[PDB]
Design a protein around this ligand. Structure first.
Ligand code: 0UP
Ligand code: ZN
Ligand code: ZN
Length: 394
């Protein structure tokens, strides 16, 4: 696993990427590591924001699948052509595999200017692959074609003219013990589509939010390396902000700050970290009635942004935001921990990162067990659409 350490890079808030090669001879591309999606897709046509792209005509091993795919989202979209080719991760397992590749021909608000990545590695399950679940995801192909164990783990690490560079590790096929401290605690994967989990309790500075736990998972809770923020459902978001405004009340920040639309600054190094509370998310444990907590510091949720106008100040963005599609445990959550995607055992492990950002008074934590009696089911059941229902599953 030594050779996979530090195999991720990126710019702050622009996702983490790993180097990959596609085709024969190998074409090198930087690929966004996304546990929030399930397609392996690469820019395969010139784009203002792409320095380079996949040129299928240049690969002797490319096989066109003679099928197009259309992938829209709320904030962006891409369309492309399906095919297969030889794919490798140079700073990954010492194997080359034949995987599906979506060759992105048209896109809108998908690629980011200066992010230095040209494709996406969707690490989630076939259920959410486009156009449907018969398009085998990359990781499934990797495990099927090689002896690579059905597990990967992510260690996402910290951050004038440019955004800060971030570093990290994607350990394919195992757990690297030098990447964490203390115990690895596991939460069950609720269902294999997104990496769906269940949050049972939420505390802000040791104070319970006092909400029906179903609210925490309305309409789902997922672990997403492709999202920067800790995203919370509307009602949960409102309660966390009121709680966070309460603890930091000595500072009257504008409304733009709480919406993540404005930065707040202090004199260089005078950040009053102590007025901001810790946030603990209790995750369902492997044992009924048991849970563990992951505690995040304000250093995780107040993202540094270098003001070119005021370089003599430390400025921050609020990186907790409102969601209408459930909780998203993005980079804000992941950066404090070593996160184990144990597909083989259908569970996600969390441990304190060997690289987490902390002060001399508090530390990001992973602690357990915690118990509850006669505990209700915190999981939400998404209303079944007739379209979804009509699908056959052969
Ligand atoms: C690194 C980040 C800053 O940027 C990107 C992150 C991702 C990964 N992943 C983010 C969440 C996703 C789906 C997408 C696959 C789902 N959401 C509801 S979304 O907001 O619609 N969204 C999204 C967000 C932006 C563009 C877009 F096409 C979709 C992909 C492309 C990015 O540029
Ligand atoms: Zn049928
Ligand atoms: Zn099917």
């Amino acid at each position: 696993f030594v050779e996979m350490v530090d195999n991720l890079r990126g710019k702050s808030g622009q996702g983490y990427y790993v180097e990959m090669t596609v085709g024969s001879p190998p074409q090198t591309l930087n690929i966004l590591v996304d546990t929030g999606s399930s397609n392996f897709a690469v820019g395969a046509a010139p784009h203002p924001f792409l320095h380079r792209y996949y040129q299928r005509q240049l690969s002797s091993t490319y096989r066109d699948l003679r099928k197009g795919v259309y992938v829209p989202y709320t904030q962006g979209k891409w369309e492309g052509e399906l095919g297969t080719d030889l794919v490798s991760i140079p700073h990954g397992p010492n194997v080359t595999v034949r995987a599906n590749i979506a060759a992105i021909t048209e896109s809108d608000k998908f690629f980011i200017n200066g992010s230095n990545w040209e494709g996406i590695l969707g690490l989630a399950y076939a259920e959410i692959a486009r156009p449907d679940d018969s398009l085998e995801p990359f990781f499934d192909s990797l495990v099927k074609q090689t002896h690579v164990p059905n597990l990967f783990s992510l260690q996402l690490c910290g951050a004038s003219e440019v955004l800060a560079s971030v570093g990290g590790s994607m350990i394919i096929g195992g757990i690297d013990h030098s990447l964490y401290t203390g115990s690895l605690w596991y939460t069950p994967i609720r269902r294999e589509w997104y990496y769906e989990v269940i949050i049972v309790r939420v505390e802000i500075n040791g104070q319970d939010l006092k909400m029906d736990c179903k609210e925490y998972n309305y309409d789902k809770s997922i672990v997403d390396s492709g999202t920067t923020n800790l995203r919370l459902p509307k009602k949960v978001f409102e309660a966390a902000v009121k709680s966070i405004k309460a603890a930091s009340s000595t500072e009257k920040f504008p409304d733009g700050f709480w919406l993540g639309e404005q930065l707040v600054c202090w004199q260089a190094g005078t950040t009053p970290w102590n007025i901001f509370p810790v946030i603990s998310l209790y995750l369902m444990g492997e044992v009924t009635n048991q849970s563990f907590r992951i505690t995040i510091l304000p250093q995780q949720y107040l993202r540094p942004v270098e003001d070119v106008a005021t370089s003599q100040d430390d400025c921050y963005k609020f990186a907790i935001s409102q969601s209408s599609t459930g909780t998203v445990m993005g980079a804000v959550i992941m950066e404090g921990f070593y996160v184990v995607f144990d597909r083989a055992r259908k569970r996600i492990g969390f441990a304190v990162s060997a690289c987490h950002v902390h002060d001399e008074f508090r530390t990001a934590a992973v602690e357990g067990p915690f118990v509850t009696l006669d505990m209700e089911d915190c999981g939400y059941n998404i209303p079944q659409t007739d379209e979804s229902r009509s699908h056959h599953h052969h």
